[PDB]
Assembly symmetry: D3
């Protein structure tokens, strides 16, 4: 929780940010959102890969044809505004584009506009978590677009994630409809074999993670070979290391899958190198060669 | 629109029925709903298959493990209350169970409770509509449960339905991932061949429609043979008649699929017999042998 | 061979029935055809299920949207004429609708007409044949419609059939993409287990055979239970009897599959009963309750 | 049209190149063909990748086991002869190997020979075309070989292409049975993301295009990264550029898919570079390092 | 254990029934087996559906082409002899046909014979068991025959069953590759909806259980409707009753699946009726109309 | 055959190496094994990639959770001992971990130990073999792990291999459930097209061959490009060269597939180069850069 939420261009008090119960998105999952992080760095509060996230927000809406009146730049300025207005230095930002109070028909009436909200609030990675392969599979290829970060998609992440927690594990790993590894409930999956980094392609129903992309680029900078390919379920038991990636989860090591220990049962050497290079970005140790750090105070 | 909405046991003015913008269901499609109709009949306002719908509401929540504090009977009484309080005789009822303002984590915290809302509002079938087979497929079997009427499911119905309308058709027909007929965007599909009634099973990713079930039971009463089996796409072009079924759509004839006329291009004889038997229920002509008509004033 | 071939409304001498090498159908498989049989009966030359075949010819053309100028009755009279003009009593008729000398573009230009020809010519059942399961699968559900009897479809029947011949068998049995039994290279497949008759549904990529349909109706008249269901490959080795059906093949018993003998290795009792009832139609022993025999001489 | 057509070793007048209506290929799609282009260049009339096309003609026939008595060299000489004898400088060549007047059985009798024809005739720019994703899928992997350019295969291209034109688009894009991008109705598909060229592998039911291969080699010469990988449907909406390739279509840019604009809605930068390099081959600007230009005069 | 084991026609002491460590079946899973039960009845020791099991033993060997020198009758006599010679009245019989000490090549040398063993030894109620849906799927249709009860098949049952026990459940339920219900780890699955009995067909990778078959026949005698059809995963949560069937497991009620209670959490009404009818066979209460009881003393 | 077999830590005479007929592995395929080769080299008897094979033995057991008391080094010393004790210089070693005389329940009781045996015995490459594509497919992805070399897996290799033999071929090539090339009955498959080496990934249900891995590393040393990708069935007819790899089979060229000759019908140039480099390891010509040769005499 925090004071003020950016709502359709206005800074509204947190308490007053309410929508009608007949809002389309509440009944039909017709919303698109993002997960962004603001880090306190050597150069002050900085939004990690800000433009990339807002670009994906637009891409997700594009796929479902949701009309978005704000440009990427407008959304970016609004985001910084909400962090400053709330006096935050370290936070989690949540942009949300949703179909509001329009008719009750599935197809919104022509000429409608979407409601936009940007809320920000203040904001394990060493011992490694225990994961299990879920009995639920992720969405098939040409059904509900897995490349779009839409609300309705999360019924799948709820099923996969809750099942793992009900059986005593920290996270669940979902396979696609073909029986290949897709990703965790809400984070991308990586494997390290003989010093090589492996990760499933988007065609394995894995969402194009921005943390995932950052890791791939950092790994190449470190001289580590990266192979984007379909992975079998057994590979999880044969891998030297395995870790998850996501904005909220950052880089989370996995020490065991289905009760089977992953090489030594602790954060591996390659996972360690990547973690250091990742966190080094906010200390100045890792040079920001790509322009991933967006200053809140511009 | 109407006055008053039943909200967690209280009759709230329509205008005051608001939820916070950080409600779980707005971001993750974590809601379950129903579509029910109240008809003005020979015995006054009557809710069609009231118990069946509330039972499915509970079943849908059960699958996702959403805690529901109200019993089927409590929900049924609440529903009648909202129709009476709003002085409605002919209406569309919308029960909605959703995860409200809890954390922002996908998995709701243990001990949480769901918010429940029941809104009601006042409420083609002769010439037949033109349909097209969509380029989007419905959810694969063990991914997102198609038997549950959940909010997140509707991203699929939006894609299928919007595509049909963008190309000039009234409704889209989706095939499953195997290439077999599933159903329309938001309604079940029926075919009539040589005086025989055909409809895809639930395993073709078709939601167990209550209108669908009613038609099957009425057809048997009329002495019409019903075959629940997987159907090929071509069968749509070879069928003598084809129609859709749903609470909102009732019994909608389809006169053409993909520009190909369906036997004579008008409402067929078998579709007609079923329509008459269906609407006869609210005139007294068709005996309510199953107890499908629930009086609002009990 | 024979004299005269009906070509676009005219009886042309067999040798003069030629078309240009640039005919669309020669390059793109854009043709639809039928297989019909004329039997010498107790009532003289009689075309078996004449109307049904011409109706399917029209249905196959309808699916591909090939314009057909002739009505079902016109085609039926032309067929009888070809049999009479050729002084045939027992023959195989081959109606063929094809896209002729139009452009070289895959999509024929608007306003084009198809060419139609009807050729007829004079026309292993006691012991049974040896069949093998092919390594090639039949067309997937929403690719090339298997319900339509089109020319291009036969590339598949060629692959399945030639492979069986090459290995010393009389016919090959194709499985669909799922690994279930579809049918023989160019004939439907039946199995008899505990006095029960089994056959794959059309959704197993099996063409809606007219001989297949006749067998199902005759079986029911004989009091034999018929189950139209998906069949596993192993079922071929467990079946008491197995036989193929088609216009050209009629009812052909299968005494072995993949070198494995089918219960006693001879024509089974149920296959025999069905054969007798089938051939009894042309002797008068079996009453033609359906009006399947169309007299040539009218 | 034009005068003369090479028919089984003889130059026959166009009007006289006729084949019997009972030719196998007319009824069973049993033919194999090629599409070749002759361009007027800085070195005169030149056949683009002549040997490559004739080699594929042989490969297609080999898969179906069609007997071809002519060698690659004989066919190449015949092709040049057709262009010279018809006084063509710029034209489209169509070699066709087909099963002619043999029996009516699906399996041609042992010892048969195929008929061979080679016809030639005189022969979506900077704005691009509008495409839509078809509701029809391309052939599954082990059904009808997608690597062979056979006549029967085109029933698929007809379904995909006609649907697109019926809805107002210029071309349709088909997905395979898995829901992944395969290719256009009769041309390969390319995508450009962040300066990288993407194209589906043959295993996505995409025919091994010779234009496709040329583009891949030219791209590498230009220093452009090429990734041959499975592509999701959503990628079409996220791509910076998208274009089709084929002998007839050459390099055709796609400005929109399903009504969604492809980055700026005009021919993209990378597409432009590749087009220039491609057409530069006929002006001498692009050095023919591989020997793709075969002079007619030799 | 017990004394004596029938080994290739000879009653050998239990301790002496040994085979070489280089026996084919130990390395390649090349064995076929059965599970039979001998019950103490009102007519003394009786082998339940004796001939049916021996017939399936032969059918399993036939599919893999394992040479069996003993006839069904010889095996049946041997079985009775094992029970008598070991003075057993209530026991579990295990016939095993396996490829013994032949070469080490996968394909046994022509002319080989299999070794046959028949061992017998002395032999989830009213509360039911807790089951979970496994993360492992059962064998795909045309891979390893699911209709054959072979040794190698059990690696699957081991994976499915062990996972369930590792998580605290009594049995695991496997889905096929399509995401539909197949069966339990080593027993068939039944569901009861509105007084109707449902069970997956063999094509859902479910082995043709002999107990399964018995239940279907008994159900029909009791006037209960039986529907053999593909079942979705969700159906387990919507069913009124669910139970497993197998020779060892007999009729075991399932009170919950994945932590979700199955209607009241106790043995259901229909399950009870079927259990009573089943066990009534051994008390004389249920007339043995089919001849399922084979007396040991004969 | 040979004298002595290492059995649970003791050198037992070959003839006395027996296990009870009730051993778990004989009934349920619950065993894991390896195939290792001892070559007579320029350095004397040498076990090829000894450590790698024992590591895979452990990995296969780990996937099934079979307890293994011996470490990799213990197993390696035992292996050398068996070769020495048997006075072998060139031989085939067969390590086998299996579940022995434990209960009859599929799930072995807690605290059980596995039995381990290591047997060794003394131990078409120039012309090439004739292969055919089998009608049986290899195990689907998430059914029975294809990465594990377990006994039960071989029911599949038996079906694929025996079918090829029965039709006069030397080996059968299996396709996966998708219709893509997987591998031979018990050996990995390679293809050579334009000087490029191709092989299916593990996700095509291909076991991670150790000979396969060696070939890939040798190819890279020779400067040959290696592409690990999914391959279509047709690619076998279009390839310039095709060969199989395995411990027993080493590098076996394939001169024809399905009666279709593979480029010239003899051992190809690239296959030759790889063979020479492979066998050169035991002559000293090829430097053992990886430490693949483990000396017996240490
Ligand atoms: C958001 C999300 C991710 C993580 O993406 P990041 O851009 O790295 O935050 C991974 N998987 C799913 C299903 C997601 O929704
Ligand atoms: C609600 C719904 C239907 C119609 O069900 P009825 O119970 O008949 O109203 C059909 N299909 C889908 C996808 C639905 O959500
Ligand atoms: C024509 C055909 C059949 C047989 O159908 P009939 O109408 O009974 O002749 C079976 N399979 C295929 C693929 C066919 O084309
Ligand atoms: C011929 C063809 C192409 C084009 O390949 P080019 O050799 O480049 O002309 C593409 N797709 C299909 C289906 C084709 O038949
Ligand atoms: C043996 C077996 C069954 C049980 O069948 P019954 O003949 O009734 O004992 C069920 N499933 C599997 C996988 C089996 O092996
Ligand atoms: C053992 C095996 C191979 C060959 O692997 P190598 O380690 O090289 O001997 C190939 N396929 C299968 C199915 C195998 O079991």
């Amino acid at each position: 929780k925090a004071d003020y939420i950016w709502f359709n261009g206005e800074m509204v008090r947190w308490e007053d940010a309410k929508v009608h119960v007949m809002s389309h998105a509440l009944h039909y999952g017709t919303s698109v959102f993002e997960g962004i992080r603001c880090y306190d760095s050597h150069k002050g509060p900085v939004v990690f890969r800000h433009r990339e996230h807002m670009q994906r927000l637009h891409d997700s809406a594009k796929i479902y044809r949701f009309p978005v009146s704000q440009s990427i730049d407008e959304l970016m300025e609004a985001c910084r505004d909400v962090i400053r207005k709330n006096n935050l230095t370290s936070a989690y930002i949540r942009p949300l584009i949703f179909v509001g109070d329009v008719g009750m028909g599935v197809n919104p009436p022509a000429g409608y506009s979407t409601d936009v909200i940007i809320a920000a609030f203040p904001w394990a990675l060493e011992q490694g978590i225990d994961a299990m392969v879920s009995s639920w599979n992720r969405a098939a290829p040409n059904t509900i677009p897995t490349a779009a970060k839409a609300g309705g998609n999360y019924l799948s992440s709820l099923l996969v994630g809750s099942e793992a927690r009900r059986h005593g594990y920290q996270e669940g790993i979902a396979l696609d409809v073909n029986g290949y590894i897709s990703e965790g409930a809400g984070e991308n999956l990586f494997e390290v074999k003989d010093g090589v980094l492996f990760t499933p392609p988007f065609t394995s129903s894995a969402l194009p993670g921005i943390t995932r992309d950052a890791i791939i680029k950092l790994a190449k900078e470190l001289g580590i070979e990266v192979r984007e390919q379909v992975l079998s379920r057994e590979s999880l038991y044969l891998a030297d290391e395995v870790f998850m990636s996501g904005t909220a989860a950052e880089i989370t090591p996995v020490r065991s899958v289905d009760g089977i220990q992953v090489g030594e049962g602790r954060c591996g050497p390659v996972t360690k190198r990547i973690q250091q290079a990742f966190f080094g970005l906010f200390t100045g140790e890792t040079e920001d060669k790509w322009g991933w750090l967006d200053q809140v105070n511009q």
